[PDB]
């Protein structure tokens, strides 16, 4: 019974991208600040063109899983649609912190807009759920944007480098690094050759509030 479960390993993803570029550059100067500091840390960055915040994992396994996922992002639109009526949802960046000493990520600052995030992440949890796809992780949720990954280095985590030390970052513990409008949700493939411009293979996308 517990064994498809068990197997359970997430291949697609929800991502809000960052598209505002006082956020992108800010990353940037971030990560080469951390590299100033201890030059082989370079290859625990994440791509610029990669920078997005996640809504949820799931494993999809075949086209007609593919397919499903599709449907159920077409379908989170109108849910979307009814908790924002029109209103910007507006994320801001500032605060950083780390899951296990090893994925480096800037946090959403507090304020409304979490919970109204937490809730759209909570509907499409479900709603997916609902038909049948698999989804979630033991890591609770937190809305996050990663700019390192300890993973991305395997060699250096046994020959030096097993944590992030959080006084690499101290400079840029209080800065505000911009907001991000919630325009675009795409659904991407975590292990398809990468677009052009560094950001994920996209299966589909909605856009919230266009005009």
């Known amino acids: 019974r517990k064994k ?3 197997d359970y390993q997430p291949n697609y ?18 990560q080469n600040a951390i590299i100033q500091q201890d030059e082989r840390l370079a290859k625990a960055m994440v791509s610029d063109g990669s920078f997005h915040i996640t809504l949820l994992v799931m494993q999809l396994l075949n086209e007609d899983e593919v397919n499903i996922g599709i449907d ?70 937190k809305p996050h944007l990663t700019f390192m990954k300890l993973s991305k280095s395997p060699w ?3 020959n030096g480098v097993k944590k992030i030390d959080p006084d690499l970052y101290e400079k840029f513990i209080s800065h505000r690094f911009g907001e991000e409008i919630l325009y675009r949700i795409d659904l991407c493939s975590m292990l398809k050759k990468k677009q052009s411009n560094g950001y994920y293979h996209c299966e589909s996308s909605i856009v919230i509030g266009e005009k």
């Open 4 to 6: 498809k479960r068990k």
């Open 13 to 30: 993803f929800l991502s809000i991208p960052i598209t505002n570029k006082e956020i992108i550059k800010g990353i940037k100067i971030l």
């Open 72 to 141: 159920a992002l077409l379908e989170l639109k109108p849910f979307i649609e009814e908790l924002l009526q029109g209103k910007h949802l507006t994320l801001p960046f500032q605060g950083i912190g780390t899951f296990g000493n090893q994925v480096g990520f800037v946090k959403l600052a507090e304020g409304d807009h979490v919970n109204s995030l937490l809730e759209i992440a909570e509907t499409a949890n479900r709603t997916f759920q609902e038909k049948g796809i698999l989804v979630g992780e033991s890591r609770s949720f």
């Open 156 to 158: 250096l985590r046994k």
